[PDB]
Amino acid sequence: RPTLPIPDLLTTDARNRIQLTIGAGQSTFGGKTATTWGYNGNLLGPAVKLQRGKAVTVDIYNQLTEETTLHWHGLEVPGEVDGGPQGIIPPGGKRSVTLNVDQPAATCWFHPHQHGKTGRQVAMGLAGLVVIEDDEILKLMLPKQWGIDDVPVIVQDKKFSADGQIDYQLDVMTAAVGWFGDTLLTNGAIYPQHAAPRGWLRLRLLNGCNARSLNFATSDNRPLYVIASDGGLLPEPVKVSELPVLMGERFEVLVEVNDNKPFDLVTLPVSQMGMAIAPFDKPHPVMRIQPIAISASGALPDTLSSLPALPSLEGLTVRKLQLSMDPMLDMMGMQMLMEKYGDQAMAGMFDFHHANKINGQAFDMNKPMFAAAKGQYERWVISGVGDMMLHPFHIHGTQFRILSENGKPPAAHRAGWKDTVKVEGNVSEVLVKFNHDAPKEHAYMAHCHLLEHEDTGMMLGFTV
Ligand SMILES: [Cu+2]
Ligand SMILES: [Cu+2]
Ligand code: NA
Ligand code: NA
């Protein structure tokens, strides 16, 4: 097995600046080269490291021949620097953003938000990580050697053509069910191996698929200790056998490396349309962990962090967000999937470019749907009632609290700081507060993070 690639950990320079270059290059997957896109390289991106309380300016060079934008997913920053569809960086052009980091330690990420093209641009290879540190987290004595016992794990599926090129399409099928493929990548490599010191291994898991939800576990069933969610540390570890992760979500887990025997991180079959076609109809390796006897001192604390109380609910503004799909989209998509894949496509279970909607509207860039309060908790009620698709619903500008998730109180490891909530044929409720402003010219997005739904209308803008 190839060794797991580790995103460079990119800090500020003497002038408090970080340079990102967006560009095309070449990658090799199982023998055949593909044109890929990357930040500061051919594929994927670095891990931009930020400290709570410190400004940094990011200089962003668009070295594509097409428009793109750069969105910091998870960051509580003004709309100006949020990099939603209105933050065009022109091909050949340079844009600079000041990020004033004021939130708990967390693993966030970044990726394009090009209007109507976000799915293709991620599929082409564009994604990096954001490691936010603060004063609280460095006191915990967690595994902290980057790329040794503190390892980013970005999991994505891709589909490839006969010539080896990435085979991306926004069509009637993928607009309905998402883009998914048959090859799993972990930091860009097919089934890599990571060499991990005895003791505690820390993994920062990102589900960076366009459309495929995942479910982590190990091959010998050893536990994961969940220490952190999208928006950072939990109050204390949650110990699990398996860990479902939606598109765009991050969890940090600790795994015990307690003797010399190799095991795999795997992902278990999910009940989501399309996502259990072979080879994903059985447990599927993500990466091989190979124990090694070098220095490590990282520990698992009893107690991680102190989070705020849920605010009381009386008097909060409530906003209804109904997600919906043209029924014509569902049918033709369900059909195209059966024609192409046969009966396996359903295991576990006409212009489409505006067929997906929130509150009966496809995303309009020039009409924000509302102004949200600044600095005041609101309750957003997001409903997927009336359709059968999975919608990981994500809200920019914020880390929120899930009050109920698709019909139940959140699981314990999902009850902390989140920027994504599951919506799937039921209704979810989040408590949300915006500490920063967003004008109509640079509004915040709230959207399904199944990328093809987003691209085909399941997005709204809002101001603060
Ligand atoms: Cu985001
Ligand atoms: Cu969706
Ligand atoms: Na520069
Ligand atoms: Na253990």
UniProtKB/Swiss-Prot annotation:
Effect of D387A: Decrease in oxidase activity with 2,6-DMP as substrate
Outcome of gene disruption: Disruption mutant is slightly more copper sensitive on complex medium than wild-type strain under aerobic conditions. Deletion of the gene does not affect copper sensitivity under anaerobic growth conditions. Deletion of the gene leads to elevated biosynthesis of enterobactin under conditions of iron scarcity when copper is present.
Binding-site residues for Cu cation 1, renumbered to this chain: H71, H394
Co-factor binding comment: Binds 4 Cu cations per monomer. Contains a mononuclear type 1 (T1) or 'blue' copper site, and a trinuclear copper center consisting of one type 2 (T2) or 'normal' copper site, and two type 3 (T3) or 'binuclear' copper sites.
Domain Plastocyanin-like, first and last residues per copy: 25-135, 197-262, 350-464
Residues that hold Cu cation 2 according to the record: H73, H111, H449
Catalytic activity: 4 Cu(+) + O2 + 4 H(+) = 4 Cu(2+) + 2 H2O
Activity across pH: Optimum pH is 6.5 with 2,6-DMP as substrate. The pH dependence of the reaction as monitored by oxygen consumption shows a broad activity peak between pH 5 and 6 and a second activity peak at pH 8.
Induction comment from the UniProt entry of this chain: By CueR, in response to increasing copper concentrations.
Biotechnology: Triggering CueO activity at need by the addition of copper salts with minor toxic effects on E.coli cells could be used as a simple tool for biosynthetic purposes. The protein was also identified as robust host protein for use in biosensing and drug-screening applications.
Top EC class of this enzyme: oxidoreductase
Temperature notes for this entry: Optimum temperature is 55 degrees Celsius with 2,6-DMP as substrate.
Family to which the UniProt record says this protein belongs: Belongs to the multicopper oxidase family.
Domain notes: Contains a methionine-rich region, which includes a helix that covers the entrance to the type 1 (T1) copper site and blocks access to the T1 site in the absence of excess copper. This methionine-rich insert is involved in the binding and oxidation of Cu(+). It also binds additional copper ions, which are important for the copper-associated regulation of activity. The methionine-rich region provides at least three additional Cu(+) binding sites: Cu5 (sCu), Cu6 and Cu7, which play related but distinct roles in CueO oxidase activities.
Protein name: Multicopper oxidase CueO
Taxon lineage: Bacteria, Pseudomonadati, Pseudomonadota, Gammaproteobacteria, Enterobacterales
Gene that this polypeptide is encoded by: cueO
